Each structure stands twice: as C-alpha cells, then as structure tokens.
C-alpha cells in the first residue's frame, strides 16, 4: 500500500564525486528503512539498516539518514566498485515495499552513435518472416529515440529493443532495435528506414534501404 518514490531513476557520475540518492515514503515509516546495492549477476547486499546504521564490512564512504518520511543514501568519495543499482526498502507497515531503484552509471563526454541498418536475409525470407535490424553503436547518453518508417509510415508496436551495459573500456552503450514483419507484409512496401534521435546528433540521422537493391 505504501508508495516508495526513489529519485532519480538513473544518474551519471564520475569517480570521486559526492552522490546522494533519495527515497520518499508515502507514510511515516519512522526508522524502518534499508538500502541495498545490486549489480548484474551478483547477489544483493545490504548497505544501510535502520536508516542510518552501516552494515559491517561496508566502507565508511557510505552514509545514511532519514526523517521518517524522506531518506537519503550518500557516497562521499565515489569508487569504481560503487557503480550499481541502489534500492530502498521500507518495513514500517505491511506489506513491505521497495523503491523502483536508482541506477548509478559512469559519466563521460557526449558521443554520437554510429547507425547501421540491416535488411532481412533471403534465407530468413524463405521461412516466411522478415527481420529488419537497426544498430546504434558507441553512444554515452542512454537517451535514444529509434523510429521505424515503412514507406514514411511511422511503425509502432512491432519493434523490440535491446541495450548493452556500459562498456568496460569507453563506457558507451549500444542498442539494437529489431522490426519484425511477415514476408507478405514485407513485400508490400519499398523503403525501410531507421531514424535515430540522439543528443550527440544535431539533426536526426536516418539509415535506409530499398527492398531488392
């Protein structure tokens, strides 16, 4: 019943910065607020219990505090081993409820993506389904809008996307949007386009091809 609003949803920072995430409780939960760290593949570990108390073995840069209604997890000098997703948990009133999380990602300079478009192979067309793949590579801002245009008709509801984690070297993301279409629908149209809107591009770039060429 109790809403736990966690802000911001995601945030960028660099090593050595001071970072505070906030968790806002719907009702007064007094001192029953826990903070957890969560990394891909790793079991979640508790960081703060009772709003302010530090779990044993957790470094001293991690701090916590609360008012009963507004809570705050703070990292003084950020380290590489702190880039993860942080969740708060209230246990003031049943049912216990979590926050949506705050993902802590590495800050770097703006990097425009490299866009590529891939028509469906003849081998796949023989099976009766067509897959058009658009690829965004090497971009720092996660914010990216990919729009499919089939003969200048904006396609929605048949496009599934996927994104990598921050690369361990250049700290960029890459994104694949796959448009799925039946063979009949595929052969009903000529121009297949992938339009990409990204902060690092002054104008939206469009990569396209013509069925058959």
């Amino acid at each position: 019943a109790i809403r736990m609003t966690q802000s911001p949803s995601a945030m960028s920072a660099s090593v050595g910065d001071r970072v505070t995430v906030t968790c806002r409780a719907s009702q007064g939960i007094g001192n029953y607020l826990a903070w957890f760290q969560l990394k891909p593949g790793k079991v979640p570990k508790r960081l703060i219990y009772a709003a302010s108390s530090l779990q044993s073995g957790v470094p001293a840069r991690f701090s916590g505090g609360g008012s009963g209604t507004e809570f705050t997890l703070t990292i003084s000098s950020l380290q590489p081993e702190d880039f993860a997703t942080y969740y708060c948990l209230q246990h003031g009133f049943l049912p216990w409820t979590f926050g949506q999380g705050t993902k802590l990602e590495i800050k770097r300079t703006v990097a425009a993506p490299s866009v590529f478009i891939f028509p469906p192979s003849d081998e796949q067309l023989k099976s009766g389904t067509a897959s058009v793949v658009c690829l965004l590579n090497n971009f720092y801002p996660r914010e990216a809008k990919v729009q499919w245009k089939v003969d200048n008709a904006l396609q929605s509801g048949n496009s599934q996307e996927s994104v990598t984690e921050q690369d361990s070297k250049d700290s960029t993301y890459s994104l694949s949007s796959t448009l799925t279409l039946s063979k009949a629908d595929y052969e009903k149209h000529k121009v297949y386009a992938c339009e990409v809107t990204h902060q690092g591009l002054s104008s939206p770039v469009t990569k396209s091809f013509n069925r058959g060429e």
């Binding site: 826990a34 979640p44 508790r46 219990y49 009772a50 796949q124």
Partner: protein, 220 residues
C-alpha cells in the same frame, strides 16, 4: 559466518507450482524472520513473504493467496510454494535472513538465488541469420541474428574467439511467441570486407545445437 543455500526447480510450465527451499547454516534460527524476495528481469525487487520460528507468516497481498511459506525447525530450513504460476512469475527468487525479534531490522544474509522461468514453450534451437554489411563505407558493421530459441542462454563467439574487439552481443529479448531472440554485432574496418573472413559461432547447450555462419557482403 552465516550462509544460506537454496535450491529448487526453476523451469516450470504455467499452472504448475514453484517449490523452493532454503537452508540456514550459522545464526540462531529462532531469533529471526526468514523471507523470500523476487526480482523479475529488469523490474526491480518485490517482497514475497516471510515466516518466523513459530510459523507466523506475512504475505504480500499482490499474490492472491497463491503463496505458502513453511518452516522445518528440526532441519533449520524454510520453503516457498507458489501455485498457479504464470509467465508473470518469471524472476530470480532469493531467500534471506529477515528481521530479528529484538529491534526488528534485517535482510542481513542472502541466498545465492534461484532463476525461475515460467513458459509453456519447448526446447528449441536457434536459427542464425546473417546481418551483412551494406555497399557503403571508414568502418563497417556486420553480425548475426540468433532467433527462435528456448530457453536461455546462447553463447556467441567470432572466428572461434579469434576476434573480440568491437564485438557487441545484445541481451536476449523475449518475443511475443515465447521464444528468445538475440543479435551479435562487430564493427570492423571496411577495407577488410574482401580479405578477412567473419564467422558466427553460436552454441545453445539445452538443445545441443551448434551453428557456424559465414557473414559476407551480399552481391548485387
């Protein structure tokens, strides 16, 4: 110091019953609540329920009385039962040391987790289709589309692991058909399209499937 070891089947069909068990080896088993937490793929954490040494249970109302949590005090174990499962119950299920009975703080120790996937799909090998570099370009891009497979995972290498730079294998995406779909991509110098060979190495252990696929520019 204190460790939790959990187990149970993680591959279920809908309407089946998930049954996980957690074993405690360390802290006094009586002075704590023992709880279950869930994390659906990319959807944050959700508290399922918990039980104390005396058998008192707190459940999350979100589960419509489908949850039953039991305790065995002579083996220091506690179990989770979730009936009438659907694909919405696909998640990683952890057991954890919940709240103590003195000052009521907890979630100290966690189980290693159990990956649970609820799908009426049968084991299927992937079809591998080429993503050819277009007649264009500096640097070029090519790859493979690994489609129609169940369950996870698939392992993709390039040239039998001879090339790793610029590779990007995207996390799988569950299609509306219940099968998984993935794409692996390489950026390579566009002056290497005629001299160097690029080949996908796709492995799907559940179906015992290996597919090698050569990726070349499509001739006009």
């Amino acid at each position: 110091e204190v460790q939790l070891q959990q187990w149970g089947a993680g591959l279920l069909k809908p309407s089946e019953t998930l049954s996980l068990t957690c074993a405690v080896y360390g802290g006094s088993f009586s002075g704590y609540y023992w709880s279950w937490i869930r994390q659906p793929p990319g959807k944050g954490l959700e508290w399922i329920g918990e039980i104390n040494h005396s058998g008192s249970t707190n459940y999350n109302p979100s589960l419509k009385s489908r949850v039953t949590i039991s305790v065995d005090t002579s083996k220091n174990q506690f179990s989770l039962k979730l009936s009438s499962v659907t694909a919405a119950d696909t998640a990683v299920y952890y057991c954890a040391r919940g709240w103590d009975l003195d000052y009521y703080y907890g979630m100290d120790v966690w189980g290693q987790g159990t990956t649970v996937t609820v799908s009426s799909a049968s084991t299927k090998g992937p079809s591998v289709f080429p993503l050819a570099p277009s007649s264009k370009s500096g640097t070029a891009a090519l790859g493979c589309l690994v489609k129609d497979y169940f369950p996870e995972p698939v392992t993709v290498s390039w040239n039998s692991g001879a090339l790793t730079s610029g590779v990007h294998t995207f996390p799988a995406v569950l299609q509306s058909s219940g099968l998984y779909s993935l794409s692996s991509v390489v950026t390579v110098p566009s002056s290497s399209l005629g001299t160097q060979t690029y080949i996908c190495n796709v492995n799907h252990k559940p179906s015992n499937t290996k597919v090698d696929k050569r990726v070349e520019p499509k001739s006009c």
